[PDB]
Amino acid sequence: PIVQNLQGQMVHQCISPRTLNAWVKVVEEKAFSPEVIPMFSALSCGATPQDLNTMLNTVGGHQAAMQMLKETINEEAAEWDRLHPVHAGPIAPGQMREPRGSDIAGTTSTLQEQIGWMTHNPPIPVGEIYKRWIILGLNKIVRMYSPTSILDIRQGPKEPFRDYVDRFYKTLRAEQASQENAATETLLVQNANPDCKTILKALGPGATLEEMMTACQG
Amino acid sequence: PIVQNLQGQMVHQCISPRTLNAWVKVVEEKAFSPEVIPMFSALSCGATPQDLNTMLNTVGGHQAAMQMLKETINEEAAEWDRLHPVHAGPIAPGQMREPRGSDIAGTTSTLQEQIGWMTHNPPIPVGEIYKRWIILGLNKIVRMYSPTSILDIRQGPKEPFRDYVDRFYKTLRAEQASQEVKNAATETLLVQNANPDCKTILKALGPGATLEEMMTACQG
Amino acid sequence: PIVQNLQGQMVHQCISPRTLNAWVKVVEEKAFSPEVIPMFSALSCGATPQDLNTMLNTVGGHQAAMQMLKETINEEAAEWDRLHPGPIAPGQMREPRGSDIAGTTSTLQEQIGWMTHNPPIPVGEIYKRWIILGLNKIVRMYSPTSILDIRQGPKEPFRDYVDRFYKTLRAEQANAATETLLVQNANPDCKTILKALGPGATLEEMMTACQG
Amino acid sequence: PIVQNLQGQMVHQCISPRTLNAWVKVVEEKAFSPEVIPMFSALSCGATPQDLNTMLNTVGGHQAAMQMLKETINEEAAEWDRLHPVMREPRGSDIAGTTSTLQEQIGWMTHNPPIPVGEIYKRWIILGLNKIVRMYSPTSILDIRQGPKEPFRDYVDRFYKTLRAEQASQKNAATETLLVQNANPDCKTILKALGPGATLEEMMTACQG
Amino acid sequence: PIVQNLQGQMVHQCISPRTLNAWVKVVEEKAFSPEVIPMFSALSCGATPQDLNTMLNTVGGHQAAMQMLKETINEEAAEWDRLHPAPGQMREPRGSDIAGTTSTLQEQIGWMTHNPPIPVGEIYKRWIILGLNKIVRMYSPTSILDIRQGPKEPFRDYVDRFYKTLRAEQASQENAATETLLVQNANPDCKTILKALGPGATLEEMMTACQG
Amino acid sequence: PIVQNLQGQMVHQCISPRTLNAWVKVVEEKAFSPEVIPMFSALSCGATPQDLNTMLNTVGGHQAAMQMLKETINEEAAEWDRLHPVHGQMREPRGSDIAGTTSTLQEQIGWMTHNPPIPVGEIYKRWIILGLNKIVRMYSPTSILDIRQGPKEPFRDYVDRFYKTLRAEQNAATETLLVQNANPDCKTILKALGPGATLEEMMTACQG
Numbered sequence A: 001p002i003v004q005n006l007q008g009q010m011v012h013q014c015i016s017p018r019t020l021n022a023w024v025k026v027v028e029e030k031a032f033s034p035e036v037i038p039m040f041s042a043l044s045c046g047a048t049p050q051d052l053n054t055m056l057n058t059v060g061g062h063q064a065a066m067q068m069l070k071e072t073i074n075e076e077a078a079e080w081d082r083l084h085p086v087h088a089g090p091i092a093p094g095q096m097r098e099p100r101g102s103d104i105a106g107t108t109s110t111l112q113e114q115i116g117w118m119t120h121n122p123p124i125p126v127g128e129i130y131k132r133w134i135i136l137g138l139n140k141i142v143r144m145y146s147p148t149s150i151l152d153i154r155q156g157p158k159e160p161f162r163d164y165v166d167r168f169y170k171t172l173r174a175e176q177a178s179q180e181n182a183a184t185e186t187l188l189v190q191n192a193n194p195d196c197k198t199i200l201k202a203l204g205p206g207a208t209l210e211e212m213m214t215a216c217q218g
Numbered sequence B: 001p002i003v004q005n006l007q008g009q010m011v012h013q014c015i016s017p018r019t020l021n022a023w024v025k026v027v028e029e030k031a032f033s034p035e036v037i038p039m040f041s042a043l044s045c046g047a048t049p050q051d052l053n054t055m056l057n058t059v060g061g062h063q064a065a066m067q068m069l070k071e072t073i074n075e076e077a078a079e080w081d082r083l084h085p086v087h088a089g090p091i092a093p094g095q096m097r098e099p100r101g102s103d104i105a106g107t108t109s110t111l112q113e114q115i116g117w118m119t120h121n122p123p124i125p126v127g128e129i130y131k132r133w134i135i136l137g138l139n140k141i142v143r144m145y146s147p148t149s150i151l152d153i154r155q156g157p158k159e160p161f162r163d164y165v166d167r168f169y170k171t172l173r174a175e176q177a178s179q180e181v182k183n184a185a186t187e188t189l190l191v192q193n194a195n196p197d198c199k200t201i202l203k204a205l206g207p208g209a210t211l212e213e214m215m216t217a218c219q220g
Numbered sequence C: 001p002i003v004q005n006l007q008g009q010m011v012h013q014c015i016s017p018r019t020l021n022a023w024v025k026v027v028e029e030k031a032f033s034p035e036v037i038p039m040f041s042a043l044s045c046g047a048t049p050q051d052l053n054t055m056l057n058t059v060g061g062h063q064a065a066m067q068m069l070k071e072t073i074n075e076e077a078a079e080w081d082r083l084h085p086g087p088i089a090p091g092q093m094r095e096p097r098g099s100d101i102a103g104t105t106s107t108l109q110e111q112i113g114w115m116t117h118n119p120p121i122p123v124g125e126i127y128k129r130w131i132i133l134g135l136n137k138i139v140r141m142y143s144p145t146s147i148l149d150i151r152q153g154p155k156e157p158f159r160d161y162v163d164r165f166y167k168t169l170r171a172e173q174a175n176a177a178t179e180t181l182l183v184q185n186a187n188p189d190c191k192t193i194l195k196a197l198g199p200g201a202t203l204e205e206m207m208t209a210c211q212g
Numbered sequence D: 001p002i003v004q005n006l007q008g009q010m011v012h013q014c015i016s017p018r019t020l021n022a023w024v025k026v027v028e029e030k031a032f033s034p035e036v037i038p039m040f041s042a043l044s045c046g047a048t049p050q051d052l053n054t055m056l057n058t059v060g061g062h063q064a065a066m067q068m069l070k071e072t073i074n075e076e077a078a079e080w081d082r083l084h085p086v087m088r089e090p091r092g093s094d095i096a097g098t099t100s101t102l103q104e105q106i107g108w109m110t111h112n113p114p115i116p117v118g119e120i121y122k123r124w125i126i127l128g129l130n131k132i133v134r135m136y137s138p139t140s141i142l143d144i145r146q147g148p149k150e151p152f153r154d155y156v157d158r159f160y161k162t163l164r165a166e167q168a169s170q171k172n173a174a175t176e177t178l179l180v181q182n183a184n185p186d187c188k189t190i191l192k193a194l195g196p197g198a199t200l201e202e203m204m205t206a207c208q209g
Numbered sequence E: 001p002i003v004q005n006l007q008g009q010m011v012h013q014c015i016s017p018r019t020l021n022a023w024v025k026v027v028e029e030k031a032f033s034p035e036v037i038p039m040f041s042a043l044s045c046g047a048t049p050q051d052l053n054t055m056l057n058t059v060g061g062h063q064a065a066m067q068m069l070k071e072t073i074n075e076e077a078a079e080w081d082r083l084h085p086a087p088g089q090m091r092e093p094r095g096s097d098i099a100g101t102t103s104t105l106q107e108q109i110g111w112m113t114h115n116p117p118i119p120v121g122e123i124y125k126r127w128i129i130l131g132l133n134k135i136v137r138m139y140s141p142t143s144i145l146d147i148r149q150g151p152k153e154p155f156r157d158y159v160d161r162f163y164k165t166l167r168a169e170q171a172s173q174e175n176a177a178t179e180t181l182l183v184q185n186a187n188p189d190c191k192t193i194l195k196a197l198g199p200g201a202t203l204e205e206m207m208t209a210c211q212g
Numbered sequence F: 001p002i003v004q005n006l007q008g009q010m011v012h013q014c015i016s017p018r019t020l021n022a023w024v025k026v027v028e029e030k031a032f033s034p035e036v037i038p039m040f041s042a043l044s045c046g047a048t049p050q051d052l053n054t055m056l057n058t059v060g061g062h063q064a065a066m067q068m069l070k071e072t073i074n075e076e077a078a079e080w081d082r083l084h085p086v087h088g089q090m091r092e093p094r095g096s097d098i099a100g101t102t103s104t105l106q107e108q109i110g111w112m113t114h115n116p117p118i119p120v121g122e123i124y125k126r127w128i129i130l131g132l133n134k135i136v137r138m139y140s141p142t143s144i145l146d147i148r149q150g151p152k153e154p155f156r157d158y159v160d161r162f163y164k165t166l167r168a169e170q171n172a173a174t175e176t177l178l179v180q181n182a183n184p185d186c187k188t189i190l191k192a193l194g195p196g197a198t199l200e201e202m203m204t205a206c207q208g
């Protein structure tokens, strides 16, 4: 990744064994649950395209998901090439060549070119552009991997209300891929059990979740 | 977070993998015991709003508490807008735009903007303001996960007095959001709910006894 | 804590997760054995009062001990307000009251300013003294046995008995009377060998003599 | 490694104990799975030829693979000698670290223009490790066939895991046709019903069952 | 400890939590096996007297050994005093100053970073290691004379127990007098081979001769 | 060890706890498998003689090997004294000075940072590695001549044991012994390949 040194300059630094083992562990233990995505975004803070490909290359299984992520990256690189064409000719002195999509994805660019773009003034943040594409692809994986539907989650008989809300917003997080509403508010009350659903309407309009869960505490 | 450079300048550092894993382990082991909050504040020392959002996003379960946490933050952000409205217009050179509630919460602000606010002269501590709101919502969550009232904490017939006082003040800590409270009534409620053997010894000590004297007396 | 920047400059730093987890693990495993106190002092090296309150606040259990700790802190702060009872000259800082040392009515900026002043006032070191004074009481409380009740078993090795004698003595005292008390409660066999060595014998001589 | 300092200068650091431990534990757990190669490349960031030999020397088992690795390195080194026939430029044995000192390696890596003997040697190592991953792959891609009761996702998992070990981590037309051709007769109908050029997300939403 | 700053000046640093935990673990898993002493010296590299007292204070059990160590420290501080009985003449440390019982950290650093320096931490560590050597010897269970090769014991396992026992009995200080005992206590089959090797054989040759 | 600060100067550093614990755990786990030696050389990067004695002194068991190591060190130090006899000239180290038995830390640093340096730390590490090589060869349970492919053993497993054994003890002679000690089935396939076959070719021809 690109970090700041003691001269106030941005310089390249090798990716650390801890960051690599942390990314491997969250994938082994949590597959593609929605919370994996912010963890990926945090562990790849300051990453170059080479680093992002490194982290993605340490995933041993889930190869169908990885191939989908590649097809998503290829569609974002094609759109980048449409909106930002590369002009022919020699590069102005002290400047970098224009990055095409395959440069941002680290397939046709060198590490030194990635450093050049990311530390230029102004910087062309090819690590952040590529990471947006990867998170777009991973969000589509989180939805495809989600088992139950938000419509399916209905409260049990003797199940406490807080456990039903737990399963509710967890499934909702996988359905929207951690994207954040009276639509989901009315689904919560509708799919409850008859005992609490009666008191929920009696609370009034636009009650807070705190108020709802105090009303169905017992 | 934003840390002191060896030069002495406030500069942005990435959130460390050790910090991320520490917060994940605290939530999975301690759930929402009261001591989780000072651990959250200590692990998020110097955090930007983006870091705070990152720590909350690593929480896998407790999604009910997380939705309730969002609702507390929205109510604090709406209150920040009422007190500090944004003066419309262009921003003077070398200045930052006035932050609104969603900027402090990190939903309509960028990382570069949060860095500018926190390292400005004088600083606008959008990271500290956001953490104050998060702790307010976490206070509610600690009370919700601690259902047992302090009135229902009663020493068992053969329970050691020290274990009874432990359950008493840990229950009192969740109810009172870890706020320091000197109050005679709770100190007499402690003696009121001791078992008959230690209650006899405590009354034979006289009123206004310190906690150390009380625990020494019921050491048997 | 307040640490050493390479420019000889005193800078504030966040408590690391390693220190936080270390102090938590020490209390969970060792409770309040006497060795917890020097571990707290060493883990709080260079601490502002806010840092000390943070370490105390991460303790999950032992809330009876923590309430006792507060009662000692309040009684020590009440004595500081006696011995060191408003305008503030430019460049300088206010004078600290007991609640300022404990970090209840003071900020991190006021604390850092006190501990980096040209005439320094170590509010963290004064606070740490108050905390250790309270941790000592908690260690005496948690010691299950008095030093008088430590007696060598009939078949217990002299080494194992002296281990319990001095571990108890450490918690109680958180000397000739201890030496006479040590030989007086050895089992009868070891006892007369101790009387046979004469007085003024080192512990190394005593333990190698009781080896049989 | 030859890494950036803090005053903007390239200096030589000792290999970190945490790095050596991470490499040893990766080999013990993953053996020679395809993901071992990018892991080796990330942990050898900036390494000199001496550092690379150190990493390979910490491998305890797999001494058959380590000997094939040596034979790949010898082939690359001999080809380097032929392509660079006789500032003294490094020979193949110099790049491999058998005839060069640590000072000569640093002097090559930090010259201007540099001769990156660490990156060259790492290229030969990765080429040798790729032949080992390919050799130790259990199954050919042509024998991956969807089970009658196997969910389509699990079949695509095995297909690309096998293809990664076969092609040694290198959308091809022969693979897109092979994936449809070896699916069970039920999903193979639904796939050809979508038409040509369907995305994998479309093919897995259809045969989601 | 006292460490080097990039400014070239010797600065004081807080003892790290990883160093503290490493020392607590060593004492808990090895007790007073001989190799604990070199691990203690390495973990206390650069230590001040205050740091050395911290490491000793984190030892949980073994309080009989800790009291023995104090008695060794007092004796060395007394001998130091007997061996050490102008405008700007620096006050030199007493035995209690080196041990840290009567000196502040500021005074300790003053001696350690003076020109010329007085390494009170290295002097104190010298006394501690002496007392630790005494504890290692006393804690050694078996005498070197009772180390005998079993009838079906491999020669290498016997030599392992022999030299490990010898290390505790000598506290890791430095002989054909040991080679004689090694040969004499080998079982009859390996002893016949060792005699046939003639005198002056290396250990390497002895273990290769007794492998079958 | 001796590492450089941010002034281009070589400075002394306390050996770290993480390095010490790593070397202790290496000896506990792997004993004296051949890879212990390059692991030692890597963990003692830049070490002084005092730091090398520290690493060896923290080994708990294997005292038979540790005494063998002392006898190897004594032989190398005596040979150094033979090859450097006594005759603003700097005093040069003796064998006991390189081993750290008669030299202080300040003298070891003075040698290692002098211009030009006398690297007593690297010279000592050379002697120690020579001694560890004898130990690894000693601990080697089986001769290379006794590694034979079982009648049901996969050829890859036989080659794994063969080269792991050859590594502990230490080429056309080895390629002969590898083919000679294979079971009669794979030995027929190997001899039918002809000369010049790589190990990759041999393992492919006998993978069945």
Ligand SMILES: COc1ccc(N(C)C(=O)[C@H](Cc2cc(F)cc(F)c2)NC(=O)Cc2c[nH]c3ccc(O)cc23)cc1
Pocket: A169, A170, A172, A173, A176, A177, A178, A179, A180, B053, B056, B057, B059, B063, B066, B067, B069, B070, B071, B073, B074, B105, B106, B107
């Ligand atoms: C309302 O104020 C906001 C609103 C958005 C944010 N941002 C920018 C975030 O990234 C927040 C941070 C966050 C996480 C938390 F667990 C609890 C909080 F209080 C805040 N994360 C999510 O939205 C992702 C998420 C978590 N669980 C879900 C359930 C269903 C779903 O569809 C999405 C989610 C901050 C403040």
Ligand SMILES: COc1ccc(N(C)C(=O)[C@H](Cc2cc(F)cc(F)c2)NC(=O)Cc2c[nH]c3ccc(O)cc23)cc1
Pocket: B169, B170, B172, B173, B176, B177, B178, B179, B180, B181, C053, C054, C056, C057, C059, C063, C066, C067, C069, C070, C071, C073, C074, C102, C103, C104
């Ligand atoms: C009277 O002296 C004070 C008073 C307040 C403080 N401040 C500023 C704190 O943050 C202290 C730090 C602290 C923690 C500790 F566990 C033991 C100590 F001795 C000090 N935190 C708590 O009090 C929070 C707390 C813990 N358990 C409780 C049970 C019931 C309850 O209602 C609250 C709590 C310092 C000194």
Ligand SMILES: COc1ccc(N(C)C(=O)[C@H](Cc2cc(F)cc(F)c2)NC(=O)Cc2c[nH]c3ccc(O)cc23)cc1
Pocket: C166, C167, C169, C170, C173, E053, E056, E057, E059, E063, E066, E067, E069, E070, E071, E073, E074, E099, E100, E101
């Ligand atoms: C005599 O020389 C001295 C005397 C005092 C010190 N100081 C300044 C200390 O802090 C020492 C450091 C220390 C600890 C150790 F376990 C072994 C050592 F050898 C030294 N700690 C204790 O006294 C605390 C202690 C431990 N066990 C006890 C049993 C009974 C008791 O009442 C107290 C204790 C240094 C040198």
Ligand SMILES: COc1ccc(N(C)C(=O)[C@H](Cc2cc(F)cc(F)c2)NC(=O)Cc2c[nH]c3ccc(O)cc23)cc1
Pocket: D053, D054, D056, D057, D059, D063, D066, D067, D069, D070, D071, D073, D074, D096, D097, D098, F163, F164, F166, F167, F170
């Ligand atoms: C031919 O190209 C070379 C040749 C030598 C080197 N040097 C300078 C090394 O230090 C190499 C590094 C190495 C290790 C590896 F496991 C695989 C590689 F490909 C390279 N180590 C060994 O030779 C030690 C060794 C490991 N197993 C053995 C089995 C039998 C034996 O007798 C010795 C060994 C580099 C390149």
Ligand SMILES: COc1ccc(N(C)C(=O)[C@H](Cc2cc(F)cc(F)c2)NC(=O)Cc2c[nH]c3ccc(O)cc23)cc1
Pocket: A053, A054, A056, A057, A059, A063, A066, A067, A069, A070, A071, A073, A074, A105, A106, A107, D160, D161, D163, D164, D167, D168, D169, D170
């Ligand atoms: C199409 O966009 C690209 C294309 C190539 C890259 N580069 C430069 C890489 O190194 C990528 C990084 C990567 C990994 C990932 F698992 C998922 C992603 F989306 C990206 N690795 C692989 O290609 C190796 C690989 C993994 N599984 C396979 C299955 C079969 C196979 O034959 C090869 C592979 C980046 C972007």
Ligand SMILES: COc1ccc(N(C)C(=O)[C@H](Cc2cc(F)cc(F)c2)NC(=O)Cc2c[nH]c3ccc(O)cc23)cc1
Pocket: E163, E164, E166, E167, E170, E171, E172, E173, E174, F053, F056, F057, F059, F063, F066, F067, F069, F070, F071, F073, F074, F099, F100, F101
């Ligand atoms: C002969 O060359 C020397 C001689 C002395 C040294 N010095 C200065 C040491 O500190 C050495 C370092 C050392 C340790 C090692 F395990 C193996 C080595 F080769 C060297 N330590 C010991 O002697 C302590 C020791 C370990 N096991 C023992 C068994 C019986 C016994 O009575 C003592 C010991 C270096 C080189």
